[PDB]
Each structure stands twice: as C-alpha cells, then as structure tokens.
Ligand binder design. Structure first.
Ligand SMILES: Cc1cc(OCc2nnc(SC3CCCC3)n2-c2cccnc2)ccc1-c1ccc(S(C)(=O)=O)cc1
Ligand SMILES: Cc1cc(OCc2nnc(SC3CCCC3)n2-c2cccnc2)ccc1-c1ccc(S(C)(=O)=O)cc1
Ligand SMILES: Nc1ncnc2c1ncn2[C@@H]1O[C@H](COP(=O)(O)OP(=O)(O)O)[C@@H](O)[C@H]1O
Lengths: 251, 576, 125
C-alpha cells in the first residue's frame, strides 16, 4: 500500500484506495454496481492511481483450499474485469492490485489488458529495515545513543509491520515510564512540600536504549518462512523458461 | 441549409432512410396513381447525440417536405388539457403543408408508458397521440418520424402496425464515421497541417457526433487559451486575420481527447472489423473452411438453393488460448464486409450472476438489425468454468445463459443473415446441446501457429513499431518452437518496452550532459536509438515464455480425435 | 553446447557426412534430454541402414537376373548418414521430459536453497 501511495505521489496523481472491506461489502450485499461508480469516480479524478488493496479477500471469504463448488469467478471480480475491459479509454486511470494470496487470485485478472504486470514485494532487507525503522521513528524523539542500523540488522526477517510494532511498543514503554515517574514525582511534592520550587524538567525526554531493548524483547516475526516459500514458488511459477537464456541471432 | 453533407458518420442508415422516403416524398404524385401503402412512421432510435434530429432535418430539406418538429417536453411542459390541443394543431398544420414530415424528438417523454403507465394525464396524452397516429387517413403524405433512446422505452402500442411499423438504429458512429464527423465539425477553424484528424479519429473510440463536436470545440478553446491571450489584445470583435493566424495543433487535440469522457463508451459496438487475413499468418485449411461456411451462401446463394442445402449458421472455434480465434472471427467478418458483434465472457458472466438472461434476447435482436452480421460469442465456456469444470455443481452442463442462447438460436435462422461464431478454450466442459444440429455444430480447431504463421504474427505485431532490418524475423519465429500468438505478442511488447526505456534513459543523460557542460555550439545528433535493434530483441527473448503447456494441447488433440470419422469407411466404394 | 556434445558423442561411431550441420540440429532441439537426442540419432542410423539394405538388395535382385549383365562397378548407394536421414529422424522427434516435471525439479532445488537474507552477511570491520 505504501509503495502504491509513493508511486502515486511521484507522478502527482490522485490516489483512490479500495480496501478489502469495501469489496467484501459489495460481495455480501450482491451490489456490484458500486464498481461502476468507483471506476467513474476514478475516471473523473484523472490522473489517478486506482488501487485495489487486498483484492484476494473475496476468494478467501469463499474458501481457498476447497472453497465453493464453482471456480474462481465471483460477482465483484467479474464487474472489476468488465470495468477494466471498458477502461483504458480514459488513458489516465492506472489500476494497482495488492494480494497476499496470489495462488487463489482469479487467473482472468492476470490476462493481457488487465493487471498483467506482476510485481513481487519481498521482505525488507537490512537497509530497507533501517529505512523502515527511521520512517516509523521520525516523529518520536529517539536518542542518538540507540543505534538503528544494529537493530535493523538484528531483525533477520522482520516485516514492515513487525518493525512498526516494535517501534510502537518501545514508544508505549517510554510513555508509561514517563507518566509513572512524573506521577510519583508529583506525589513527592504533595507529600513533602519543598520550600523552593525547581522542576528538573522531564525525567525521560526521549526514547533510550533500555526502552528499545525491552520492546525488542517482545519482538516477533509475523511472517513465517513457509508462506515466504509459497511466494517464492509462485514467483518461480512465472519462470521465463530454461532454454532461451542464450538466444543469439544468426550472424 | 442542412443536407446529406452535414449528416456525418457514413453509418449507412441514412441511405436506408433515403431509400425509404424519396418516393413517398420525392415522387408523391406517383403514389396517387399506384395502390401502395408508404411508410406512415419511422422510428429512429439510438444513443443520444447521434444526430437523429439532424438526420430528419436533412431528409426534410433534401426532399422538400415541410419539416415540423414536435419537441417531447415542449408539449409535456404545457398545461394539462391544452397540450393535447398543441399535438392536434401540430398534426393539422403538418397536414396542411402536404407533403410534410413531423419529427417527434424525445418520443420517450410523450408516450413513455411501458405498460407501467403511471399517472392520469400522461395516459390521456399517449392515447390521444395513438388516435392521431392511427388516424392518418392515408391522404396527403405526412411522414411521422420519432426519436427514442431505445425501442422498448416508448409505449408498445406506438410500435404496432401503422403507428411506427419500421425502425432504424442510427447507433454510434464508427472510426470511418468518426473521421467524417470530425471533418464536418472541423471545416471553418482552419485546421493545422500537422493535425490530420486520422490519429484522433482512431483514438476517438466511444465518442458520438455530439462528443466529436464537443472535443473539437474543446481543442479550439485550448488553442485560443494557449495563444492570443498572452498578447491580450482584445476589442469588441476579434480581428479575423489575427484569429486566423492560429492553427489548432496536434497537442491541443490530444489534450482534448484526454479530456473527452465519451457519453456512452459502454454501449455495444456494431462495426465492420478492420482486421484482415494478413494479420493471421496461415490457417489456410481453417481460412478456406470459414470462407466456405460464411461467404459461400451469400456470394453464391443460387447454387446453395439449387442443391437444396441449407448452410450451417454456427461455427465453434476450439483451441489453446492466444492462438487468434477472435482475430480469425474478425477477419472472416471483414472478408464478407459484414458487421461484427463480439460478446466477451465478462458479459455472459454478468448475465449469469445477475440472473438476467433477457439480455440475450436484446443482443440477438441487435445482431438481427445489423445484418449482415457475425455474432461472435467469445470464450463461451466461461459460465461452465465459473460453476466448476472438474466436479462443478450437482446439476448438469445446462445453465440459464446458455439455455437462453440456445432458445434464441433455435428461434433464429429466420433472419438468414446473422452468423453465430463461438470460441472456447475448454471444449470438454462446453454444453453438448450447443453442438447439436441447428446450433454451433461446425467445430473448427485452431492449432498453435506454425513457423510461417509465427513469422506472420511477429510481422503483424511489429508492423507499427520501427524494426531494424538487421533483426531477422524468420529466425526468431523458427526459434520459438511452440510459442502462442499471445506469447509472440508479449515478446514483441517486451522488446519495444526495452527499446523505449533505453531511449528515454539515454536522451535523459544526454540532456544532463548539456546542462552540466553547456556546449558552445548546439548540434543534436538526433535519436541515439531510432529503431528496434537485435540486442533489444535478444534481451526480450531472454524472457520469452511458453504460456500454453503441452498437456493442454494434448487434451485438445484428444477432443479433436474425439470427433473421429470412424475407422471402417475410409475405403468406401460404390458397387460397379 | 551440451546438446551438441551429446550429439557428437552419439554419432562418433556412425559415419556422418560433414555436410550435415550438427550444431543446427542441437540448437533446434529446444529442450530434448540426452535420451531424446540418442533416440533421434538411433532413428537416423536405422533409416540409413534400411535405405542401404533396400537399395543394395533391389539392385542385386535386378542384377542377378542376367548373369554378369551390368558392369562390376562396386557402388555404395548410401555410405554415410545423409541430411535427409536427419530430417527423417526429426519428423519423429519427441520431448520426453514435460515442462511440469522440470518445474518439480526446480521446485525441489529451490526448497534445498540456503534460505534468504544471509547473502549480505559480513563480519564487522
Ligand atoms: C501516445 C500514447 C499515449 C497514451 O497515454 C499516455 C498517458 N497520458 N496520461 C496517462 S495517466 C497518469 C499518469 C500517472 C498516473 C496515471 N497516460 C498513461 C497511459 C498508459 C499507462 N499509464 C499512463 C496511450 C497510448 C498512446 C499510443 C501508442 C502507439 C500508437 S501507434 C497507432 O502504434 O503508432 C498510437 C497511440
Ligand atoms: C437459397 C437460400 C439462401 C439462404 O441464405 C443466404 C444468405 N443471405 N445472407 C446471408 S448472411 C451474411 C453473409 C456473411 C455474414 C453473414 N445468408 C446466409 C445463409 C446461411 C449461412 N450464412 C449466410 C438460406 C437458405 C436457402 C434455401 C436452400 C434450399 C431450398 S429447397 C426448398 O431445398 O430447394 C430453399 C431455400
Ligand atoms: N454525424 C454528425 N454530423 C454533424 N453533427 C452531428 C453528427 N452527429 C451528432 N451531431 C451533433 O449532435 C448535435 C445534437 O444531437 P442530435 O442531432 O439532436 O441527436 P439526439 O436528438 O439523439 O441527441 C447536433 O447539434 C450535431 O451538431
């Protein structure tokens, strides 16, 4: 989702995001004409990047291992395909689809004239992890003592969500410690009224190494290696053959 | 005034209207000495903004008939009890100036009742209009033409014999008609030399005559905004020479096209496909068989009648995806110069999910009106796949949409012009009833393109792109042992993409070089990559892939030999 | 290159004319296994042998009718595998290994791959 937003920002084009709950609502309510309205709205706001976040939600709702007796076709995806086929006229709307379950996605979605350009987003690398940590912690006051590159490198396979959770937990620990400390310090001034008022400011003005260590103590890898293995399988399921790698013209 | 020249689009229904109305109007005295009933009413229907009122006015002017226009809401906006007076007076005045043409624009407002018929006064208006329309005493020559978006929107009694007994669907103009509409709408703006109106016409798919006029006006306004505003020299009346100095450039038209929003892109297209047999490199047996089945009954109907044989009006293409079945259908339609209607799988799936199969009736009626036509049901197996294919539903292969299609086909053949073509990538799951006689019985197998066919496909895909003569195409086609048409198209597209990226990156760097190091003398060396080269194609082929596996080709071969002509008659000889 | 080497090794014993471009045959065989190339070579040799036996026999059958009739010229009708024999062989060319089970082999090779994320591993300087 962030990548789609960034690409929209670079082109300075309007961004429309259709999350999975909206698609599920259209599917449960048997109201797919909303797809027509959504596409018309995207057409009006041109240049736009129409992003269908978590497009595989309907397939998951119907199953995924056994599912319904019928095929992958569903009402909402069929309407989306009809709108896309009737699209391209506008020359401005660009459809971006994100799916965590490529195996269950309808194959018709990937046919030419549809979302054919498949892009694989892998788990963030060490440098990518450092950047994600910096972005998450840009607003929060972080002490220079806490080394971020070391933390990013330490996280062997943490996802962006996992890094965000670690940062949020560290901030929560810092907030709780600051609140508890200033609360006690206020008792100390109520219990023993000091003759001269001299506030020492905040006992914890910025996030320190100990906060991050305690937060990382609870760090967790949300994404298991088996689902990464399935994604690697699909990626190599879009394999460019194995006999043309040396293709040379006759000269 | 307005005439046939003003009427653009060359959509070939204006000719039909002419043939309809000359003698009743051009030769009115002739019908006095001959006992024949002329066309009392003609119902022109189609998408709004297609020039129906313009066509009626042009016919009235070119035939000399007194044209009378009865605006729908003009009478509807009048007070109840006196609007009926307006309609009656309109008919009387048109009666006085015999011959006369009475045009009822927006007829779906005076008589919108589709048997729902809400209200009270509107029922009076519809009934009185019915009395007047049926009250034509066949005296004089008043012809009542009416405009309506769709035939079913108006009251059915208006569609009955003697009120509106014949209908013409003006429909959306086509590329040739879009170009002619652009020419008619671009004749006094002093169009620039660079702009040709041909590229704009091709890119103008989905627009109507009103849309074309609006796009031209928007381009003119962009030209006026870009120039002559900077100078800001304005008076009560802009100087003719100053305004003439500007020329509408291709960029202005491109921006206008970007800002078009055509008013009925979704409407179904009835157009003669521009595809030709050249695009498909081979299928000579298939090409000849298609030529037989479609072209022979019409080119030589007499010989078909002599032997008392009724030609099959249905053909079912089966084969792997991306082999050119849709293109083959378009080519066969083009050779016969017959309108082509394509019903892709999404439409069938929409009708099935929505439980609305009456659309099949509407589709068949539209195909019947646009005769000669080739009604193609692309990817007809979509519903079967949606319901399963290996286990599927508990029921059989029968489904609502296919059943409606079968009913329409069984009730078809009367028209003698509509030809049904079906394409399916899963012949095993297709309903058997589809293949019974009187249906799509002629099964045609489209195999993977051969080496020569592959060469032709590559040439067709790369015809527009600048391809260097150094890159040998026959070698590439032969190298691709089993690539489908889609695979070859993907390879060509990837090569073009690589060339475009390299050209963009190179000229971008070269521009830095001048910005970083301003050269004393400006001497552009032109484009660093002017055409697609061998290295681009080699890199693209590096990613070449075979979409169609050999196992699905094996299943198609099985079905093909599942239509096996026995094994004991091959030597049949008569006793002599 | 491996296909060319396999074809050369299979045809070393058999007398193959220099005119036949073996590299073209190897490159045209997109994904044939070694067994398929050996089968093609064996079929070409069989075609050459059948042609030689039929032609020499039919010549001898006609010649034997008249004693000493034609000259004593020692003709070899087919003394080497010709190009036409190689086209004859390729008409029956078959792909033993389907792309799906190659997919399975590459799948097992991926599963055996050393996970991911340790490529950039470097000791601290
Ligand atoms: C020239 C051209 C431009 C185009 O459109 C460009 C465009 N403008 N705004 C946008 S959208 C906005 C941008 C950021 C967010 C979205 N786009 C656009 C188009 C496609 C993909 N992404 C963007 C289409 C098609 C063509 C052409 C190509 C070949 C030929 S011929 C007969 O073979 O010689 C004729 C016509
Ligand atoms: C003579 C005839 C013509 C026909 O129709 C010809 C036709 N015209 N436009 C078209 S359509 C257009 C053409 C290109 C796209 C589609 N067709 C047509 C008909 C069938 C198949 N394809 C086209 C039907 C049936 C007959 C006859 C055959 C035998 C007998 S008897 C009693 O045994 O002696 C009586 C009548
Ligand atoms: N083929 C054409 N040639 C010239 N003008 C056209 C054409 N098609 C549509 N128009 C434009 O459409 C405008 C209005 O459309 P109209 O003729 O009233 O059809 P409708 O009543 O169905 O909307 C006209 O003012 C005319 O300029």
């Amino acid at each position: 989702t962030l990548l789609a937003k960034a690409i929209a920002n670079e082109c300075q084009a309007n961004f429309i995001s259709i999350k999975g709950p909206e698609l599920l609502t259209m599917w449960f309510g048997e109201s797919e004409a909303n797809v027509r309205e959504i596409f018309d709205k995207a057409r009006q706001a041109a240049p736009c990047v129409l992003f269908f976040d978590e497009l595989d939600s309907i397939a998951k709702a119907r199953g995924g291992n056994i599912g319904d007796g019928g095929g992958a076709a569903d009402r909402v995806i069929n309407q989306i395909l009809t709108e896309m086929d009737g699209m391209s006229t506008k020359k401005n709307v660009f459809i971006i689809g994100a799916t965590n379950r490529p195996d269950i996605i309808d194959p018709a979605i990937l046919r030419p004239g549809r979302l054919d350009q498949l892009i694989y987003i892998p788990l963030p690398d060490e440098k990518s992890r450092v950047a994600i940590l910096k972005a998450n912690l840009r607003k929060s006051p972080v002490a220079k003592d806490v080394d971020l590159e070391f933390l990013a490198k330490m996280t062997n396979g943490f996802s962006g969500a996992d890094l965000t959770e670690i940062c949020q937990r560290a901030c929560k620990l810092a907030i709780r410690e600051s609140i508890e400390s200033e609360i006690r310090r206020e008792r100390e001034r109520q219990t023993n009224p000091s003759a001269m008022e001299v506030e020492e400011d905040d006992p914890v003005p910025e996030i320190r190494r100990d906060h991050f260590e305690e937060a990382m103590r609870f760090a967790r890898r949300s994404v298991s290696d088996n689902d990464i293995r399935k994604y690697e399988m699909f990626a190599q399921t879009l394999q460019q053959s194995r006999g043309f790698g040396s293709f040379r013209f006759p000269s | 005034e307005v005439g046939y020249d003003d009427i653009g689009g060359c959509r070939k229904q204006l000719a039909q209207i002419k043939e309809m109305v000359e003698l009743p109007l051009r030769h009115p005295a002739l019908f006095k000495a001959i006992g024949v009933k002329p066309p009392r009413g003609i119902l022109l229907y189609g998408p709004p903004g297609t020039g129906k009122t313009l066509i009626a006015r042009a016919v009235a002017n070119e035939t000399g008939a007194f044209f009378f226009l009865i605006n729908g809401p003009e009478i509807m906006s009048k007070l109840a009890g006196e609007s009926e007076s307006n309609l009656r007076k309109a008919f009387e005045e048109a009666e006085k100036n015999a011959p006369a043409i009475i045009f009822i624009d927006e007829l779906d407002a005076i008589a919108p009742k589709r048997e729902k018929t809400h209200g009270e006064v509107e029922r009076r208006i519809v009934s009185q209009l019915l009395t007047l329309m049926d009250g034509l005493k066949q005296r004089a020559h008043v012809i009542v033409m009416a405009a309506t978006n769709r035939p079913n929107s108006i009251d059915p009694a208006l569609r009955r014999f003697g009120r509106f007994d014949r209908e013409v669907d003006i429909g959306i103009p086509d590329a040739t008609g879009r170009l002619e509409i652009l020419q008619i709408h671009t004749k006094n703006m002093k169009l620039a030399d660079d702009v040709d109106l041909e590229q704009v016409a091709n890119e103008t798919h989905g627009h109507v005559g009103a849309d074309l006029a609006a796009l031209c006006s928007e381009a003119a306004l962009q030209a006026i905004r870009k120039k002559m505003d900077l100078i800001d020299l304005e008076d009560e009346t802009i100087d003719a020479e100053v305004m003439n100095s500007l020329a509408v450039t291709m960029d202005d038209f491109r921006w206008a096209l970007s800002q078009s929003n055509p008013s009925a892109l979704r409407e179904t297209v009835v157009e003669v496909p521009q595809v030709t047999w050249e695009d498909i490199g081979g299928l000579e047996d298939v090409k000849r068989e298609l030529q037989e089945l479609v072209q022979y009954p019409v080119e030589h109907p007499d010989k078909f009648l002599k032997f008392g044989m009724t030609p099959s009006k249905g053909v079912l293409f089966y084969g792997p995806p991306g082999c050119g079945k849709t293109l083959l259908a378009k080519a066969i339609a083009n050779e016969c110069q017959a309108n082509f209607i394509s019903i892709k799988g999404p439409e069938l799936l929409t009708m099935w999910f929505g439980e609305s199969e009456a659309n099949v009736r509407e589709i068949f009626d539209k195909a019947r009106q646009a005769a000669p036509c080739v009604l193609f049901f692309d990817e007809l197996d979509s519903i079967a796949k949606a319901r399963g294919g290996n286990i599927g539903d508990g029921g059989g292969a029968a489904d609502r949409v296919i059943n409606q299609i079968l009913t329409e086909m069984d009730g078809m053949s009367t028209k003698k012009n509509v030809f049904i073509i079906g394409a399916t990538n899963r012949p095993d799951i297709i309903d058997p009833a589809i293949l019974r006689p009187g249906r799509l019985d002629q099964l045609i197998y489209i195999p993977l393109p051969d080496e020569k066919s592959r060469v032709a496909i590559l040439k067709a895909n790369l015809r527009k792109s600048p391809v260097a003569k150094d890159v040998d195409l026959e070698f590439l086609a032969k190298m691709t042992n089993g690539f489908s048409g889609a695979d070859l198209t993907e390879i060509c597209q990837r090569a073009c993409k690589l060339a475009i990226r390299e050209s963009i990156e190179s000229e971008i760097r070269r521009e830095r070089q001048t910005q970083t190091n301003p050269s004393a003398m400006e001497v552009e060396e032109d484009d660093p990559v002017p055409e697609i080269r061998r290295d681009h194609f080699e890199e693209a082929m590096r990613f070449a892939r075979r979409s169609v596996s050999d196992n699905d080709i094996r299943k198609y071969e099985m079905f093909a030999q599942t239509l096996q002509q026995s094994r004991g008659f091959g030597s049949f000889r008569f006793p002599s």
